[PDB]
Amino acid sequence: IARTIVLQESIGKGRFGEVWRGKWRGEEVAVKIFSSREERSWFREAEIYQTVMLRHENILGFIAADNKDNGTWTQLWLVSDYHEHGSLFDYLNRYTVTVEGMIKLALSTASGLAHLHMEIVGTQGKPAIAHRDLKSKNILVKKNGTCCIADLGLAVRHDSATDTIDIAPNHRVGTKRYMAPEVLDDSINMKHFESFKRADIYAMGLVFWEIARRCSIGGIHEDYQLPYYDLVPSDPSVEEMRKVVCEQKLRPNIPNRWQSCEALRVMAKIMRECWYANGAARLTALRIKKTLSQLSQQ
Ligand SMILES: Cc1cccc(-c2[nH]c(CNc3ccccc3F)nc2-c2ccc3ncnn3c2)n1
Incomplete structure (x- = not known):
């Protein structure tokens, strides 16, 4: 997951963390990145999106939760489908x-x-x-x-x-x-x-x-x-x-x-x-x- 995604463009900051347009194996994805001190927010969102039988065409398509260590600090990631029109x-x-x-x-x-x-x-x-x-x-x-x-x-x-x-x-x-x-x-x-x-x-x-x-x-x-x-x-x-x-x-x-x-x-x-x-x-x-x-x- 995170190892193979390259961030391209900042989209915006929500309640916590920041959303980016990234590329995964050439394909655009959205990436929400949280800091170490925002683990509870990251975990809870990951938990909701991993609910059994949640996927549906009118719910954002969730790909993965992951961690990425850049050598100085840890980033907590959520990865989803990317929609070019945005909100x-x-x-x-x-x-x-x-x-x-x-x-x-x-x-x-x-x-x-x-x-x-x-x-x-x-x-x-x-x-x-x-x-x-x-x-x-x-x-x-x-x-x-x-x-x-x-x-x-x-x-x-x-x-x-x-x-x-x-x-x-x-x-x-x-x-x-x-x-x-x-x-x-x-x-x-x-x-x-x-x-x-x-x-x-x-x-x-x-x-x-x-x-x-x-x-x-x-x-x-x-x-x-x-x-x-x-x-x-x-x-x-x-x-x-x-x-x-x-x-x-x-x-x-x-x-x-x-x-x-x-x-x-x-x-x-x-x-x-x-x-x-x-x-x-x-x-x-x-x-x-x-x-x-x-x-x-x-
Ligand atoms: C679980 C997850 C992973 C990646 C992005 C989002 C997501 N979370 C919100 C919540 N809203 C939000 C956020 C920041 C700033 C401002 C706002 F209103 N949006 C998006 C999102 C997903 C996909 C996409 N494609 C093009 N934009 N885009 C945005 N969720």
């Missing part, structure tokens, strides 16, 4: 999409989240998994115009037999802008795994809003914005978010334009039904997938 955030900043394109991005995202969330029962069993930091910067766009989900480092895994979670969750681990109301106000019951699934759904609703803005019909579309761009600072605090989302009870604005088009009407209805304050009221990822699959056929 959905980058993609939506650079491009507009068609109705077809929008549905493909939304459906693929929902399909990946439904797979994450779904327990697969059997001898080779997959636990249900919640992401805890879903956002457009953590979703990649493939050449074929579908998405796959990345940064599984903060994920939690469910044991169905006991209704327990594999780690002891801390409060408010993810990106503040995308935190669900119950995460912002700390009312979430973090002994209840379903609560983490429901919080992911709220975040996916925000991502859908980002996509729909860029859906261009007759040359008409909105400019790229992050959710709540109109209400909070860049790099918002929990308190700034809580005042908007919990107290004033605002959600991203749904433009009037989105009523002129069946696909955009279906997307807008999904968003509203991801954004309820009470997590139990929100749609499931499986139900969103079904709705978009049917829309995708019509």
